[PDB]
Amino acid sequence: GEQIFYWSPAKHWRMSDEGVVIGESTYTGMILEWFPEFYFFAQTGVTINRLLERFSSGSEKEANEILELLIQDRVLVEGILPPREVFSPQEGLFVNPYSEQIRYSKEALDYYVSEQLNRTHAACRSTKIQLETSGALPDIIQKRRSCRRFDMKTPVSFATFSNLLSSLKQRKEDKILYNYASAGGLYPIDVFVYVKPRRVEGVKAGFYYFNPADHSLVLVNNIDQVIKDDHELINQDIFAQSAFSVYLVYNARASMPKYGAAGYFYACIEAGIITATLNMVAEDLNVGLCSIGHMNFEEIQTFLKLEDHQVILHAIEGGLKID
Amino acid sequence: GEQIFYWSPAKHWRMSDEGVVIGESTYTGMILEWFPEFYFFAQTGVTINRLLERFSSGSEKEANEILELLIQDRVLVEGILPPREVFSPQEGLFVNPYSEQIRYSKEALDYYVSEQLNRTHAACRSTKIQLETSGALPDIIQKRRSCRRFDMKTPVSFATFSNLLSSLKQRKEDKILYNYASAGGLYPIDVFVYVKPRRVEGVKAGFYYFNPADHSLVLVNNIDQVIKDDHELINQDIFAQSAFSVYLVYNARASMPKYGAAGYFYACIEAGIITATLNMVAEDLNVGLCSIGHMNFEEIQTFLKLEDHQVILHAIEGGLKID
Ligand SMILES: Cc1cc2nc3c(=O)[nH]c(=O)nc-3n(C[C@H](O)[C@H](O)[C@H](O)COP(=O)(O)O)c2cc1C
Ligand SMILES: Cc1cc2nc3c(=O)[nH]c(=O)nc-3n(C[C@H](O)[C@H](O)[C@H](O)COP(=O)(O)O)c2cc1C
């Protein structure tokens, strides 16, 4: 019925001359009298009305204004946090020995990378075992690259697309089995796909939920579409060229009832497993993929009609390779 | 020189009749007068001496006792949190609609699983696209299973072991390349291996750092060993039989200088990619693997001589398959 909000675990606070600092923002007005009790109260799970009844005492317009802002600013949340918010506090614990100019200079960055690729563990002793370089590895593994340019004219055949997604399907064989591992065998990653118009034979544009039990796509949304402004600038041409987008979504209901918060962590690992498994079948079918770290997931989540117990973990752009 | 402690982002607090509640524990004595200022002060990064100078005012033995306990209880920490602590607060946000008896009953669990494997997205419309089941998938992918019984007599040949780990090595080819994807191409997962005595041809028992630039093992620790009590009960026979253990470690210094906290999240995905990539080469070489979700990583971290900027993400047991 009514929405229940919690104090975000990712948000810590502090008093100021200016007001109450929560996260990276300072807040003003009534809220200064509300603390510390407001922090204690909000951790228990409370509605907006119960917050007003407990703290309003004065302009009820002025109180809704600061609550509206704590929801806007994600200090009060309705469900599990998406991964960006889960991890954000770790910035405050990592002491960075490099200069911030790594992020602003392709020349400073090119240097940081070559240094990290030649790193070694500090606690190493002066003994070594040189392994044999000779051995032969599967070509689907060794030739896989991050593909950022696709054939924008030839449609992905329905067979190729079907074959790609059968890597993620179920197999009934004395017991249900997948082609990839999963903590508890709970397989709590919901898989969704956005297909661009005319780019996949047999699949109208839209957002679809991949059902691994049927090996089917089930329509979710044909009204909205993904655009380039939903992508970080560095990725917009990748998206422009891609034929489809895969979205890996954690269903907390498929995991936390058994593993608690550790299941969310396990689902982040499982997201990698799925990406790697897909990326190998792709190379077999001369499909290219590119992982996307970040995107306007706030919008995608709304297009996919996700619930409080579902969050987007990862995204992948795909399509036929040129030539 | 001196150690600098931060208030753990994973820890929230509350006042009580009994005392100050921090995390799932209530604390007593001097600490009740120290709040709220102690919370504000500790977020900035402070030494033990500066804490004493600012709050002692009284029994300095009684103050070291509560600080010793806040460090023991991980309320005050020296670096990035390991994944279990990163995620733990999410339990407080997930509203569980199932009974807790899922965790205590193999019959309640067997039922929760079959229900989650037949789940569907709630926002689905009544349209479907049935994909072709026909397509053929690589056998290294389709036949891969979680292997929990190994040949404990035949040693993994040095060639097989070398070939397995070349999936994780670098390749100089106009530019440095790996066989698997990584955000920013920073490859911030340090790979370590524990080898049991007599179980891998050419590799003495011990902990080793895998250097992907040389394709070498570099000794870290031959004194300590992993034992069964370092494993969850459910996994102890898996470990007992395995020939070696792989540990995937996030080097925050190889990632956060560029991506901030998001690089830690990306490294959790990358851990999956690595596990899947390894698990495919393994199947090619008739090596079995099993992922381990949890283990006494507090001990392993010490055996690997990790620094504040390194945390263990995942573990894998491996060895030759029976017959
Ligand atoms: C992140 C992760 C953690 C896992 N942890 C464990 C574990 O602690 N113990 C275990 O026996 N298996 C573990 N597994 C293996 C799964 O139980 C297994 O993948 C699942 O039962 C499906 O079986 P399959 O690999 O044979 O398809 C783990 C898998 C993943 C992806
Ligand atoms: C978690 C993750 C996120 C990624 N995000 C992006 C991205 O946002 N943009 C991009 O161009 N590439 C992205 N990539 C691809 C990497 O940049 C790529 O794997 C790396 O440069 C190594 O190249 P290779 O795949 O050709 O070996 C991502 C990879 C991973 C594993």
Numbering used by the authors:
A (entry chain A), B (entry chain A): 2 to 324
Sentences from the paper on this structure:
The bacillamide biosynthetic pathway is a common, three-protein system, with a decarboxylase that prepares an NRPS substrate, an NRPS, and an oxidase. The oxidase is shown to perform dehydrogenation of the thiazoline in the peptide intermediate while it is covalently attached to the NRPS, as the penultimate step in bacillamide D synthesis. The oxidase forms a stable complex with the NRPS and dimerizes it. We visualized co-complexes of the oxidase bound to the elongation module of the NRPS using X-ray crystallography and cryo-EM.
The structure of BmdC shows it to be a dimer of di-domain protomers. A single copy of BmdC is present in the asymmetric unit, and the adjacent symmetrically related copy completes the biological dimer. The small N-terminal domain contains 96 residues and features a winged helix–turn–helix motif (wHTH) with a very small β-sheet. A DALI41 structural similarity search reveals this domain to be similar to the precursor peptide recognition elements (RRE) in ribosomally synthesized post-translationally modified peptide (RiPP) processing enzymes with Z-scores ranging from 5.3 to 6.5 and rmsd values of 2.0–2.9 Å over 61–69 alpha carbons. BmdC contains a 45-residue loop segment between the RRE-like (RREL) and Ox domains, that wraps around the Ox domain of the other protomer. The loop contributes 1764.3 Å2 of the total 5777.3 Å2 per-protomer surface area buried by BmdC dimerization. The electron density maps showed very strong density for flavin mononucleotide (FMN). One protomer contributes to most of the side-chain interactions, with both the FMN phosphate, (through Arg145, Arg146 and Ser147) and the catalytic isoalloxazine rings (hydrogen bonding of Arg149 with FMN N1 and O2, Asn236 with N3 and O4, plus Gly294 with N5; analogous to interactions observed in flavin reductase P51). The conserved active-site Tyr260 points toward the FMN in each protomer. There is room for the thiazole ring to bind between this Tyr260 residue and the catalytic FMN N5 atom; a glycine from the crystallization buffer is observed occupying this site.
